[PDB]
Amino acid sequence: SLRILGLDLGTKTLGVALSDEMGWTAQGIETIKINEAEGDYGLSRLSELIKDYTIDKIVLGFPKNMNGTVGPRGEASQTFAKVLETTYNVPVVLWDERLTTMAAEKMLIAADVSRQKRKKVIDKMAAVMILQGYLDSLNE
């Protein structure tokens, strides 16, 4: 079926999430290890990851601007959105509505998660959160 891909671009990791068949929940697929310094954006693995699915849209975590101004991570993300769009010929949506990193931290502390596990999980789950927030917005 058609699925929406969710992505989180980092310096060292590309987070990958996929919508379920009903477009209700976001599933984690993988955290692609990548790196800008060599120009590694994780494109080859992404392509393999999605050849079995049919993706009609890509949602990409996009850092908030500083009141109209784009920062360097946002600049790399916008360039990556162009890359994505022109590589897969699907609409690419910049998105930031999700359970926030600070809400996650608070609730993780409330669950008694140790400081190092909190960091790992918050880093691991950014693409799932971005995609779930998008899907939750769409389902409204």
Next chain:
Amino acid sequence: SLRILGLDLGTKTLGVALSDEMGWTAQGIETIKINEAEGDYGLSRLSELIKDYTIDKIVLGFPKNMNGTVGPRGEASQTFAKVLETTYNVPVVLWDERLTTMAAEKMLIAADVSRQKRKKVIDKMAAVMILQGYLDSL
């Protein structure tokens, strides 16, 4: 400074959240043990908890309606909103937007939190997600 109260009415608990001094983020205060079968909605305890603050709006969790129809919980909250509003002379918002319940569940499952603890934490945070839902709407 004026604050916005967030509420989660249950059958035996009343979840209480309070906005920051700044109007941007919701904070958890307590989960009031009440007893709706006895007409104990925790009004007293509530009032005591908010006598130092000056509230100008209350955000109360409301169940979405199924094609304009709501269950026993919705009847209880809809009514509860009228009581709060006329009791405190502050506008009461009925919030029926979905919360980040499933996102929280997923993040807690990734952190290896057990089923019993996830349930407790998510129940604990209802008031805060409701209030947060609203603050972000403004």
